[PDB]
């Protein structure tokens, strides 16, 4: 998504210090953090989290690095979906497929050898954070840490 | 000048001599050391000599006795060894040392260098040493041979300074 | 007198690119050693260090050679003695140099016919960025005609993933490049992860490219095993305290001071700038509890305490 | 000792209580001491039971310095040479000393070492030849094994100290204090946290020392660990012994320090000396341990000597009620990051190999 730069400016535009971090080196930064806060693009029944890819990439660190994890979610983002593992979610296009290399022959800041748009599409855009990693879930209904009241408030929504 | 000075007329030691040396710093492969008998000039000991691959021994400012291996006088590099010294020599050096050291502390009376060239070494040339037969300055008078005058004041300190310290 | 050994080092890279940077350094030291005409043991070790450090500071104080350079010194320093003929010194000296280079050049091979059976029929492997180590073993496996597939981390900022897949694609291997932000999603599929190495530490730690520990915890959490291939001359004598205590030249992860005075679901080319990037670090460290087996010319080491016994064996 | 049917009594001390096996028997007075006891040994035996803060190192030193006096004052029964009979004399000194306080690991290993050098001693020597030898061996032991190792550890220890750190120690480790004072003398900019605990607040004397060198120090009891650890960034522990599994064996509160440190992501550094390594291992902190009399915590309040009584003064005669206080507990190795031996910084799991480096390539 590259949405970090947009998030960066919008914060810097509001006079607060920023420092972009490539998605590959979040772990090295955790010891320096005191709190981890991410948004929500969707919430399932079991307390899980549907957000942009790499959201779970963080919460495991916060877990292992013993740092808390909070996610901001609006009520109207709850969903009836209930994925078993951290993978079983409906996805449009085929994802993470391989090639077939028949016997032929086709042929440190290296900033221009990047995966093309095609092979980037093969990557997924969403990951899922299981509820065990969400120390706190904040909504318009309040903050919900039970991840069972997630469901009770959920049932209260679907009439 | 006459701040620090040499001990024996040979500016360097020969191969297979025995010399007291005070360790300084230890590198990745050697032990940079300063042979104090010759105005603390530098030498090196290969990382192959111990004194019972012993990491604990990190000596700084300890006098030790070693043996010369090779000498390159034009570049000043010297190679020594330790685990090849014997019994008597390993203390004969010390026995030879402090006496020689004692004489050095005498000469810095106004030098805190040339008297070696004038008096000490030719005397050390005769009796093989300065200390050895130094006491003859009260029981003989062969010490008069070829004495060269400094100036008026410290002209005769010998008969002014023998048995002392 | 070459007085510019770095060029020989450099020239080696053009006489052969298929050799690691430290290999050229040693291959250059011998050329210095063989041509150097001394007369004292101290003379050698004096210019040797003054040559290694001269070789060190020239390459941004890289770690790979910094090991190999120091190890090589402390190698010949071992069984060194001077008896009678001084020329015996150089004789024993430089002869061991080529002998060390022999093992050094054959090291990256010795792991191949040793780590290839780690790949099983139809297995699926994961690799963070290109590394000369993981490449050959896979090829030395694919050469044996065995079916398997491989993901590759894009490995920002190095971007070495884009090259790694090609080297595998060229060698008749199915690939699938994956973003650095989507490794966790891939662990469900993978049966075994495997990365190279840029430096092995006193505690069994693993200094490699920036995102290794990122996926090391995943395999640890996804219960898939973790393996790393490291040549002997990559053991280092340092010893950190965490996933962070490493000396790093450029200061990293600074913030900005914003004074009150100022101004498709896949949005490609909307990234950080080169100036923004270099603020981010470059290397990573996976504590030994996350690796299940080092792959060395010395063999496979899993204790990550015996690595120290071996590390002590490597040094004096 | 009526006999070793009193040892059968110990065989009866294996009952329901987890501490049934832990030996409580002591002799803190010189009542009815045997004849064959050296005076300078008596003083030590008294110093054992009554001293506090008795650092595990100093005991080994004060034991050896005392042992020389025994042998120097020893004379063999002539007609029977020295080596054949010396041990039983010394063996009769230990058996006394243990009845004042059980042998530390720092002492037992030295005992097993000297007893060795007694056997290997060359018979073709004489008394004045023999005894003079091992005195140097004893002195050599103190030079190489502890003082130098101590002098090496500190240097390697303060090396990994970084300007701006916040150090946390607990209950006065002479080695840990020895490295802390070195850190100030090299201009390292930092500050120290001092954790103390009941009963004999061994941490105050650590505060006394560090303060008398002018260090920003902080004193809080262990029941505040949850609070203070957020400020801390590194942890230093001096151990009584390190186990061949890699576990650290130190004073009772050592474990929670390492535990709370892990769950707060701070490193745990075990500054221990090689001669305090042991071939044995422990899974629970209860199988091999030593106690202190439970009366010492009856005194509620901030003092120990001061006659401030308590509500438990009758606990000895109140059934279903018992006070106790173990002095040591193990600490699982996965919580120790590094061990600092004179062989350098090692992972704690590498301990037993180092012990083999002594057994091997020596005798």
Rounded Cα gap, residues D73 and C260, in angstroms: 84
E-strand ranges in D266-318 read: 268-271, 277-278
Contact C308 D350 (CB under 8 A): yes
* CATH code at position B69: 2.40.50.140
Rounded Cα gap, residues D92 and B78, in angstroms: 57
Q: Which residues of D touch C288 (CB under 8 A)?
A: 347
CB atoms closer than 10 angstroms to residue D212? 9
Same domain? B10 vs B58: yes
Specify whether the CB–CB gap between C180 and C154 falls below 8 A: yes
Contact C40 B78 (CB under 8 A): yes
How open is the CA angle A111-C242-C244, to the nearest 5 degrees?
30
Cα A100 vs. chain centroid, distance in angstroms? 31
Specify whether the CB–CB gap between C239 and C199 falls below 8 A: no
Question: What does the CA dihedral B136, B138, B141, B145 come to, rounded to 10 degrees?
Answer: 70
Contact C217 A27 (CB under 8 A): yes
DSSP class of D275: G
Same domain? B153 vs B165: yes
Rounded Cα gap, residues C108 and C121, in angstroms: 24
Nearest to residue D81, comparing CAs of D138, D122, D135, D115? D122
Please, what's the b/e burial string for D63-80 (b: 16 or more CB within 10 A of its CB; e: otherwise)? bbebbbebbeeeebeeee
Please, what's the b/e burial string for C182-193 (b: 16 or more CB within 10 A of its CB; e: otherwise)? bbbbbbeebbbb
C265's torsion region: left (phi>0), alpha (psi -120 to 50) or beta? alpha
| Closest chain B residue by Cα to residue D146 | B56
Same domain? B75 vs B137: no
Rounded Cα gap, residues C61 and C281, in angstroms: 15
Paired tokens of D154? 């500190």
Rounded Cα gap, residues C171 and C193, in angstroms: 20
Interface membership of A31 toward D (CB under 8 Å) = yes
Rounded Cα gap, residues C99 and C34, in angstroms: 14
CB atoms closer than 10 angstroms to residue D242? 30
CATH no., domain A1-157: 3.40.50.10470
Rounded Cα gap, residues D260 and D286, in angstroms: 21
Contact A60 C217 (CB under 8 A): yes
SS3 state of residue D237:
strand
Q: Please report the residues numbered 47 through 66 in chain C whose beta carbons come closer than 8 angstroms to any beta carbon of chain B.
A: 48-49
Same domain? B129 vs B52: no
Specify whether the CB–CB gap between C184 and A127 falls below 8 A: yes
| Closest chain A residue by Cα to residue D265 | A65
Structural domain that includes position B151: 86-165
Nearest to residue D60, comparing CAs of D119, D113, D121, D130? D113
Rounded Cα gap, residues D137 and D275, in angstroms: 15
Substitution target from B25, B53, B56 for chain D, most D beta carbons within 10 A: B56
Contact B56 D155 (CB under 8 A): no
Alpha helices (H) in D51-142, listed in sequence order = 56-73, 82-98, 105-120, 127-141
Same domain? B77 vs B104: no
| Closest chain A residue by Cα to residue C213 | A27
| Closest chain C residue by Cα to residue A65 | C243
Nearest to residue C34, comparing CAs of C2, C6, C58? C2
Class of residue C128 by CB neighbours under 10 A (exposed 0-12, middle 13-18, buried 19+): buried
Rounded Cα gap, residues C58 and C77, in angstroms: 24
Interface membership of C308 toward D (CB under 8 Å) = yes
Cα D232 vs. chain centroid, distance in angstroms? 26
Same domain? B50 vs B15: yes
DSSP class of D216: -
H or E stretch covering D205: helix D203-211
* CATH code at position B101: 1.10.150.190
Identify the structural domains of chain C with CATH numbers, from first to last.
Answer: 5-112 (1.20.120.1070), 113-314 (3.40.50.10470)
Nearest to residue A144, comparing CAs of A36, A34, A49? A49
DSSP class of D103: P
Q: Which residues of B touch C86 (CB under 8 A)?
A: 70
For residue C240, what are the CA distances in angstroms to B56, C310, D188, D264, D346? 21, 18, 19, 18, 11
Non-local (6+) Cβ contacts of C98 within 8 A are C30
Q: Do chains D and C touch (3 or more CB pairs under 8 A)?
A: yes
Q: Which residues of D touch A66 (CB under 8 A)?
A: 263-265
Distance from CA of C300 to the nearest CA of A (A): 27
Rounded Cα gap, residues B37 and B11, in angstroms: 10
Non-local (6+) Cβ contacts of B70 within 8 A are B15, B78, B79, C39, C40, C41, C82, C86
Non-local (6+) Cβ contacts of D332 within 8 A are D247, D255
H or E stretch covering D359: helix D351-359
Q: Among B85, B107, B136, identify where a domain stops.
A: B85
Same domain? B80 vs B108: no
Resolution (A): 3.5
Render chain C in DSSP notation, one character per residue: --S-HHHHHHHHHHH-SSS-HHHHHHHHHHHHHHH---SSHHHHHHHHHHHHHHHHTTTTT-HHHHHHHHHHHHHHTTT----S-THHHHHHHHHHHHHHHHHHHHHHHHTHHHHGGGS-TTEEEEEES--HHHHHHHHHHHTT---EEEEEE--TTTTHHHHHHHHHHHTT--EEEE-GGGSGGGTTT-SEEEE--SEE-TTS-EEEETTHHHHHHHHHHTT--EEEE--GGGB-S---SSSS----SS--S------S-------TT----HHHHHTS--EEE--GGG-S-EEETTEEE-SSSHHHHHHHHH--
Interface membership of C88 toward B (CB under 8 Å) = no
Name B6's bridge partners: B38
Contact C41 B75 (CB under 8 A): no
Distance from CA of D237 to the nearest CA of C (A): 15
Non-local (6+) Cβ contacts of B79 within 8 A are B43, B44, B45, B46, B68, B69, B70, B71, C40, C41, C42, C82
Substitution target from B79, B80, B81, B83 for chain C, most C beta carbons within 10 A: B79
Paired tokens of B41? 């000039």
Q: Which residues of B touch C40 (CB under 8 A)?
A: 70-72, 75, 77-79
Rounded Cα gap, residues D337 and C240, in angstroms: 10
SS3 state of residue D194:
strand
Name B34's bridge partners: B22, B42
Q: Please report the residues numbered 226 through 285 in chain D whose beta carbons come closer than 8 angstroms to any beta carbon of chain A.
A: 263-265
Size of interface B-D (CB pairs under 8 A): 12
Q: Which residues of D touch B61 (CB under 8 A)?
A: none
Provide the domain count of chain B.
2
Rounded Cα gap, residues C87 and C215, in angstroms: 53
Same domain? B36 vs B105: no
Sorted by where each begins, the domain ranges of chain A are 1-157
Contact C265 A1 (CB under 8 A): yes
E-strand ranges in chain A read: 36-38, 49-52, 69-72, 126-129, 136-139, 142-144
Rounded Cα gap, residues D175 and D271, in angstroms: 7
The full length of chain C comes to 316
How was this structure obtained? X-ray
Exposure of D341 in the CB half-sphere (CA atoms within 13 A): 22
């Amino acid at each position: 998504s590259g949405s970090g730069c947009l998030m960066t400016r919008t914060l810097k535009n509001a006079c607060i210090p920023t420092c972009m971090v490539l998605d590959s080196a979040v772990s090295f930064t955790m010891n320096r953090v005191d709190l981890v806060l991410v948004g929500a693009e969707g919430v399932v029944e079991n307390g899980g989290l549907i957000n942009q890819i790499g959201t779970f990439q963080l919460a495991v660190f916060a877990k292992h690095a013993h740092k808390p994890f909070y996610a901001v979610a609006e009520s109207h983002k709850f969903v009836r979906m209930f994925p078993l593992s951290q993978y079983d979610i409906p996805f449009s296009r085929p994802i993470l497929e391989f090639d077939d290399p028949s016997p032929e022959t086709v042929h440190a800041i290296h900033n221009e050898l990047i995966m093309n748009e095609e092979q980037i599409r093969n990557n997924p855009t969403l990951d899922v954070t299981p509820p065990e990693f969400v120390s706190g879930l904040i909504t318009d209904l309040g903050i919900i840490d039970s991840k069972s009241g997630v469901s009770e408030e959920l049932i209260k929504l679907y009439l | 000048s006459t701040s620090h000075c040499r001990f024996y007329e040979n500016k360097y030691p020969e191969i297979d001599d025995i010399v007291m040396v005070n360790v300084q710093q230890i590198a990745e492969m050697g032990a940079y050391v300063k042979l104090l008998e010759y105005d603390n000039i530098e030498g090196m000991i290969l990382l192959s000599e111990l004194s019972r691959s012993i990491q604990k021994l990190i000596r700084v400012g300890k006098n030790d006795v070693a043996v010369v291996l090779r000498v390159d006088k034009e570049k000043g590099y010297i190679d020594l060894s330790k685990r090849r010294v014997s019994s008597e020599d390993i203390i004969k050096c010390e026995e030879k040392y402090q006496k020689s050291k004692t004489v050095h502390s005498i000469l810095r009376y106004c030098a805190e260098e040339e008297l070696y060239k004038t008096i000490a070494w030719p005397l050390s040339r005769k009796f093989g040493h300065a200390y050895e037969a130094f006491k003859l300055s009260i029981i003989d008078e062969t010490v008069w041979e070829g004495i060269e005058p400094p100036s008026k004041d410290v002209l005769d300190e010998l008969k002014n300074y023998i048995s002392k310290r | 007198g070459e007085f510019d050994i770095v060029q020989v080092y450099k020239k080696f890279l053009q006489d052969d690119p298929e050799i690691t940077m430290p290999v050229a350094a040693i291959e250059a030291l011998v050329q210095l050693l063989s041509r150097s005409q001394a007369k004292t043991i101290s003379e050698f070790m004096d210019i040797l260090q003054n040559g290694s450090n001269t070789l060190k500071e020239g390459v941004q104080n890289n770690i790979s050679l910094s090991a190999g350079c120091d190890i090589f010194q402390r190698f010949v320093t071992r069984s060194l003695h001077d008896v009678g003929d001084f020329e015996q010194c150089k004789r024993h000296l430089v002869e061991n140099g080529k002998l060390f280079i022999q093992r050094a050049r054959a090291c990256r091979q010795r792991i191949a016919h040793l780590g290839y059976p780690l790949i099983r029929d139809g297995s699926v492997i994961l690799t963070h960025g290109f590394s000369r180590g993981v490449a050959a073993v896979l090829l030395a496996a694919a050469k044996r005609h065995v079916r398997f597939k491989v993901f590759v981390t894009e490995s920002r900022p190095s971007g070495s993933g884009c090259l790694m897949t090609r080297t595998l694609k060229n060698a008749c291997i199915p690939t699938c490049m994956v973003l650095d932000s989507a490794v966790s999603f891939t662990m469900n599929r993978v049966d075994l992860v495997l990365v190279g190495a840029e430096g092995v530490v006193e505690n069994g730690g693993l200094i490699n490219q920036i995102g290794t520990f990122q996926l090391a915890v995943f395999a640890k959490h996804a219960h898939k095993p973790f393996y790393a291939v490291a040549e002997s001359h990559k053991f280092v004598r340092m010893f950190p305290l965490s996933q962070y205590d490493i000396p790093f030249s450029r200061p990293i992860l600074e913030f900005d001071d914003p004074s009150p005075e100022t101004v498709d679901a896949i949005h490609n080319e909307l990234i950080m700038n080169e100036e923004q990037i270099r603020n981010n670090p470059t290397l990573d460290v996976t504590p030994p509890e996350f690796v299940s087996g080092l792959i060395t010319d010395l063999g496979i080491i899993d204790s990550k305490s015996g690595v120290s016994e071996e590390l002590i064996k490597l040094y004096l | 000792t009526d006999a070793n049917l009193q040892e059968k009594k110990i065989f009866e001390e294996k009952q329901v209580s987890i501490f049934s096996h832990l030996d409580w028997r002591r002799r803190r007075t010189t009542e009815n001491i045997p004849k064959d006891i050296h005076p300078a040994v008596i003083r030590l035996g008294l110093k054992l039971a009554n001293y506090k803060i008795f650092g595990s190192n100093q005991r080994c030193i004060d034991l050896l310095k005392t042992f020389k006096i025994v042998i120097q004052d020893y004379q063999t029964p002539y007609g029977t040479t020295l080596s054949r009979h010396l041990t039983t004399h010394i063996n009769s000194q230990i058996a006394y000393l243990v009845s004042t306080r059980p042998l530390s690991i720092s002492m037992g290993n030295a005992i097993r070492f000297l007893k060795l050098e007694i056997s290997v001693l060359d018979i073709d020597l004489t008394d004045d030849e023999g005894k003079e030898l091992l005195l140097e061996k004893i002195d050599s032991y103190i030079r190489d094994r502890i003082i130098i190792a101590g002098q090496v550890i500190v240097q390697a220890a303060t090396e990994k100290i970084q300007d701006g750190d916040v150090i946390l120690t607990y209950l006065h480790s002479s080695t840990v204090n020895d490295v802390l004072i070195h850190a100030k003398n090299v201009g390292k900019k930092f500050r120290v946290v001092v954790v103390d605990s009941r009963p004999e607040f061994e941490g105050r004397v650590c505060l006394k020392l560090l303060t008398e060198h002018g260090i920003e120090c902080t004193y809080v009891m262990i029941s505040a660990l949850s609070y203070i650890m957020q400020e801390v960034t590194k942890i230093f522990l001096g151990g009584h012994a390190m186990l061949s599994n890699g576990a650290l064996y130190s004073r009772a509160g050592t474990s929670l320090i390492s535990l709370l440190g892990h769950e707060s992501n701070v490193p745990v550094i075990a500054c221990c000396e090689s001669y305090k390594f042991t071939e044995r291992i422990q899974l629970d902190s209860l199988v091999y341990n030593e106690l202190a009399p439970g009366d010492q915590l009856v005194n509620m309040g901030v003092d120990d000597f001061e006659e401030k009584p308590g509500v438990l003064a009758n606990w000895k005669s109140v059934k279903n009620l018992k006070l106790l206080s173990l002095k040591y507990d193990v600490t699982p190795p996965r919580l120790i990051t590094v061990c600092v031996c004179e062989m350098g910084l090692l992972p704690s799991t590498s301990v037993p190999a180092i012990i083999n480096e002594f057994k091997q390539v020596y005798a």
